[model samples]
Target chain A: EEDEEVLYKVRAKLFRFDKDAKEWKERGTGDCKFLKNKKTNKVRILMRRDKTLKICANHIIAPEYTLKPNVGSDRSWVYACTADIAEGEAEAFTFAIRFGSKENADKFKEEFEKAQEINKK
Target chain B: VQFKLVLVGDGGTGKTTFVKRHLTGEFEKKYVATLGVEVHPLVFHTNRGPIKFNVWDTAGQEKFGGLRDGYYIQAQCAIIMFDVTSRVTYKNVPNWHRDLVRVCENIPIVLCGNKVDIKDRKVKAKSIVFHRKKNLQYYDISAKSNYNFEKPFLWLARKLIGDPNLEFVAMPALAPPEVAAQYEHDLEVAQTTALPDEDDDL
Candidate 1:
């Protein structure tokens, strides 16, 4: 069942909400390399099997910034969601983003650097 | 151990305000709709390593109902809050409980009765009995006065860290095995019987 699950990788630009500036200015960009699809996607004709994947960002400075599960809201700080490719793909898809703490904002900056290194290779 | 704590309850129950008090130490009086979810991290210095918390505050508005399960992917603890002044908010605790169980299995949950500061306007008599029957740890708190606010968080943290001094509150068991099996079977049947394009309909 674990192997059968679908997985995706996401990458997004992290920004700190500048209260003085009144806008989210980009601080850095990071990649979340894995996410699981816990259930099957039930598209009409395309019946592509849904996959549940787990994501890991090893150098994440503040893992505590990760979002908690809620019944009726998008998971936090998820700027983009896209299919995890075995080889190559086009651009990623943006989904959602969140930041409720300073630690979260700082960790995102550190992770963004690590993600850039991976993308370079 | 790291714990994922989530805030769940009806609209205007002070869920976000309660969270903000811990995060910022000052309470603000504006009611802004939560777009989707917000993440906050708290660290409590312990004898061992610092116990870290990843807390998520979710939107309680009715229109955002469809996004609930998305946030419950890996939750380990839940805080179900209700406004003591609102009967409707208190009535939704059971619904919140059911939803949490469905998404996160059997996890530790702390039930909170918010807005104790407003003494004159409180929930009616019958609803209080309903809350007690659910057998959840209840705390009457006021985000305004900050009354009994820290107790809920401390209790939940103790439960998460497995405090030896604290007596474990047995979580109500999930659906019986046979009942759960039947539900799964029914879901499979429904999926199979439904038209192929159900996703498109959404």
Candidate 2:
């Protein structure tokens, strides 16, 4: 085993990966949100297999939440599961998104847009 | 008549073989696991009229489980298949059935037991018991031998259209050994003829 001493390159947020618990424990009470830069804030979706993936949520998304999905043309669809590793702050809180058909990428772009409506409320 | 059917089950439980058997009229010996889902259109000229069955044969590997829920979404009916020989696949049937109901609201379901031709039958009798409990129907089928293969589609079609009048003429469903070889051979021609669309971009 490499006893490599690692240091924090920069300040961290929300959670930290615990070596003993082997899980990401929450660190801060602050909630996470997408930047206000409309140009950079966009959803990047692709068909992971048969599920519609929403990794780049344009609107602010939170942990452990999911939206009711609409199945699209050509049998394109949506699915969810717990994260083995958190890709984002809340992937462990909820199922990481994936795509069934790439067509759902557009559909899920719409799904992310609705998050804006939720945020505004 | 148009109906969308979805198949969800464990990998190597013969979902692809089952679909291929009907579309190509052959039982392929080799096993090809689907990458995601394969959309195939099958037309059955039943007495009611031309029943166009858009069958979605989904991958069974849990690595594809994310997409699994997506594939489970939206269907007129579904076929939950499992290998009768593997108790794991058999035990997992309820989980698959659970996923189906999440996306589709109590759509008609056909619980199929595959590989019943094998001498050692791991799944038996209680399939009927579970059928009643779940309000689903059951049948022992084998894609390798093409036994009672067409029965599930007929049941789903009849149920979807609300007609018990439609029935398939029972043929000698089991094929002899030599024909198994022919089945594999014929499937190659079928795969070959459909290549252009697959390579159309290039």
Q: Roughly what TM-score does model 1 have, to 2 decimal places?
A: 0.50
Task: For each candidate in the order shown, give its overall lDDT on alpha carbons.
Answer: 0.51, 0.54
**Stretches of candidate 2 exceeding 4 Å from the true structure:** A1-121, B126-128, B168-202
Candidate 2 per-residue lDDT over residues B1-202, each given as its tens digit: 7888998899999998888766633345567678889999976655566678899999998766447778866688899998888888888888998888889987999988899878988766564355678888888898755567768988887897788997543111111110045534433332222111111111
DockQ of each: 0.05, 0.01
**What is the C-alpha lDDT profile of model 2 across A1-109, one tens digit per residue?**
0121111011111222233432322222111222222333321111110011111211233222344322212211222222222223323221122233345434544
What is the per-residue lDDT of model 1 for residues A13-98, given as tens digits with 9 covering 90 to 100? 22222334223333222333322223422111001101101111112111222222112222234322222221123222222233
lDDT of candidate 1? 0.51
